[model samples]
Target: TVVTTADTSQLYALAARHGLKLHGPLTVNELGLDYRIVIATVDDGRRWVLRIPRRAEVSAKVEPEARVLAMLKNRLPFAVPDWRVANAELVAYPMLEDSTAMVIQPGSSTPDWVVPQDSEVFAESFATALAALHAVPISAAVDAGMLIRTPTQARQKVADDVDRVRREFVVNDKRLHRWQRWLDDDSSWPDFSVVVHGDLYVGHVLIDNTERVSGMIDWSEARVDDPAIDMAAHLMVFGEEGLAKLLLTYEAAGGRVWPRLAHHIAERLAFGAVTYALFALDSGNEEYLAAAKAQLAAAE
Candidate 1:
């Protein structure tokens, strides 16, 4: 497996050994973190998504993520990633042991494709799915070997995250001051913990041919933590109006609305925006920079 190039020959061969033949070249997924994702269409015209871990740390995340996915089965309104036995073959030199694959469409949920009229229903379904996820019993997740973060640990995690943003991105002093002020105030940190998607950006969610989130992908960061972690990401990514609709729908779906929901959303979006901008600058990607700046501007 060529890490530099998204090679799928070995994976294809492995799949063949399991009697699943794929056609054409595998499409690489750039946003895949722990693994480089490759999507290929089987002979039957079915699409299969494969995740090949880049390193040992990434490999460690795969099984736990698979476990979390298994535990959350049928607990939500839609499907999660499904890994078959054929998807988990360990091969040589390729160092591609435990890499998982499942049949899923390549496209994911985006704010732009949502119709203006269906925006409310879309928001409702998204919030409903999220509420279902958070409502799952923490014991089920822990029983599956996933990590748990206490309320204090969760808050400290955010404090540490601010430092990460500071180290990674240089932003305006006034903006940095806003982040500091949020960090300095611990009163907003909630006392409850739930099963959080941990990294619940819109991109992690898969959309149907229509607007609703039919699938939520990437369970590597899933954990029992502050519900606000997912909530803040939802609000931060979608901006003001999205948050307003989401808040109404989320609460109506019986999700808990934290007292500092707005405050948390502001800080997370600000920090995330700067981090996104810095990444874009380093990568020479103009689109992301503009989008990130819009997030910052929205926060203001």
Candidate 2:
């Protein structure tokens, strides 16, 4: 419902700097988020994504994300935003490209909707795609200027976050009947690590009819950490069998997994349920929350 106030004239100028064809704005609504379009050209082709957010929030996450994509550029296997002309001038809002123009799979929605995919197919596609991501020499691949993280760095951050969430959820509080686990894991933890696609879910991931994963959008949360974070993401959506097969594929791809990674998967298996429920309620979309609850019940 909140709209950005950046001058359209300045945005047009930015488009010109990138040599993109500046078409007029197009407004669209999906998942309760309203987007303002800015069509532009890439090479001989023309594309557009709604520019959302304008510089005004404290510790806003979008700009850093844009920087990561800009840093990675063409290095990533999956399609991401082209922020070749990004900077502090363009932090608060992302100049999103049109998803329909890309080789996306059927049933994927524009302006952000979780993929309306079959459970089996979703699991397979997500798993294989994640494997592709883990396949990259992430450390060498990432632009150090853009990506500022390590396993040790991320553990501190995630640990802090987990602790914060734990206190908020109050896992040990008897009044909280929910299956919450308060973690104070200050011992030996995961040493094995790879680049994680921060929020690897059907919502941000896009596929094609042939099941080719054409896109993995929103890389702002990209982190170098335990691959289990990604594995846990799968469990949040796909559960144990999906988790098993995915790990099988990852290992088959020669992916290295460390011990106790399953703990993270188990943890998200709980939070992911709450996450889906909140998302489902917010968007008035039933898929993720229902699916998460079903998986949680199965786990229970």
Candidate 3:
């Protein structure tokens, strides 16, 4: 494993400036190509996510995301690491170089390996939560700096990305086969839009023993677009059976479930597998490569 490291000195200094005391082993990392995600515990024993962009140029994405988080504060049923939770200025100073940085409050999400005992209940609550998120007026999120894109535009972006994956590797499999129809057929794309979590899945959802979704994290990719991507994320973690429950619950909660929901699920999950595989290849991490391949197999 190639351990990605960060200088905690500047990070610690930033914490001090806010009167927040942070301790060592402050350097924790997550698999991210755009940002170096550091998990550090504060003096109050709360966890916080320190997002440092990989490139100075792309660093600008951080602050806008922070603003969106601030807008969403106290609005949703589930806990999100909004700007209010970020002890320091959403973007810090000194070593960060005016480049974007974000401090996420402490929280734990449901692990992928854990399965809920009450599948039906879990599905319903999860759908209701997503419905609430989708129902939030897009303007609130858009006004807070989230990118607004039509369904066609969103699908086009994914189509280009799927093509990029093909160019990245000379690989051929069921995952690649599944993407062709979606890439060429505009009809498969959704029309309705909402504030989507964009990169949603079980990993981002926190759960309690009662089997209810407690919190969600990693809102940096949040945007106003087709909600199917979020729904597909459900399929990415759980299978079709789980999705059925989710849809039923979504409809019950007054969420407009997209007609072509399955298509988007296939597209986003496929994109996730390909993107993760690409990152794995770059990191020389066979573990993630195998994990990425597993997503393809599951999608098939």
Candidate 4:
């Protein structure tokens, strides 16, 4: 009888040993923070998603995310992406391991396919999912170890990250004028220090074949921040009218502490128009720069 121990490095061989043959080249997920490898395989009547991420930058975040999912599991009405195992970082971020073959979600490959296409860009359906998530008791998250990035920490992260954004894209003419506004506006205020999914994108969510978020994944960026910051995903990415629809639907789902519906959407759009593009440039992700150009065009 042979037992497996410390054999994480040779996941492929496990197939031959187990009398199961694995096919397809192991893939890498570069969108994430580290060198991430994804393995794909089907056996035992199940399809498995395996990830091996070995980047120190986000590994700091790994433990917190694990805890967040645990807290979110029973709390939300919707399904959270089931985590078979989260100890994915020790394999030098390779794509294959004996127990699993990490796979990329369709969202990553199909970035142009926007969610909430029916409700416009904001995906009112996302609001339904969010409403379910928002219902999670704040006390529970805090008690379960929410890594609260304080206003000072949050502001510092924005400021530091934005500085990078500015240096990468020197074409934010609008931001030149609006920089003062960000300095002046006391918005994105921290009254509701709720748990926030730090990186919010429809892509982070998994939709069934029908395109509903099977439940969100990639929790490495979850953090405790102002609830108003939550608006940035829909309002900035989806535009004014779409955002309004999102907020309305979320409200129907018992979402409170959201930014005021009475507030004008123009400013929000203006900021998104100028900045997110810079975000793309700074990150060298080109896609962001294009978005910035589109946002600028929209503002005009």
Per-residue lDDT over 208-283 for candidate 3, one digit per residue giving the tens place of the 0 to 100 score: 6666776777786788887877887678657787877788878889898667777666676666666676666666
> TM-score, each model?
0.74, 0.63, 0.74, 0.66
Q: Give the TM-score of candidate 2.
A: 0.63
Task: Quantify all predictions' global Cα lDDT against the true fold.
Answer: 0.67, 0.54, 0.67, 0.55
Worst 10 residues of 1 by lDDT: 91-100
How much is the lDDT of residue 238 in candidate 1? 66
Could you tell which candidate, 1 or 2, scores higher by lDDT? 1
How many backbone overlaps does candidate 1 show? 0
Off by over 4 Å in 1: 1-8, 17-19, 24-26, 30-33, 43-45, 85-118, 164-171, 273-300
Give the per-residue Cα lDDT of candidate 4 at 63: 61
Show pairs that collide, candidate 1: none
lDDT of 3: 0.67
Which pairs of residues collide in model 3? 47-106
Best by lDDT: 3
Clashing pairs in 4: 11-97, 11-98, 37-95, 39-101, 39-102, 50-102, 116-123, 206-214
Query: Model 1: per-residue lDDT, tens digit, 1-300?
Result: 346555566777866776667786566766643456676677766677666676675565666777787888778777777665323342111111122112334454333332333366567778888888888898898898888888888767766765665675555567767877876777766778889887786656666545666777767679999776686666655677777777777788888777777667666665665556655655566776677555545535
Candidate 1 accuracy as lDDT? 0.67
User: Which candidate would rank higher by lDDT, 1 or 4?
Assistant: 1
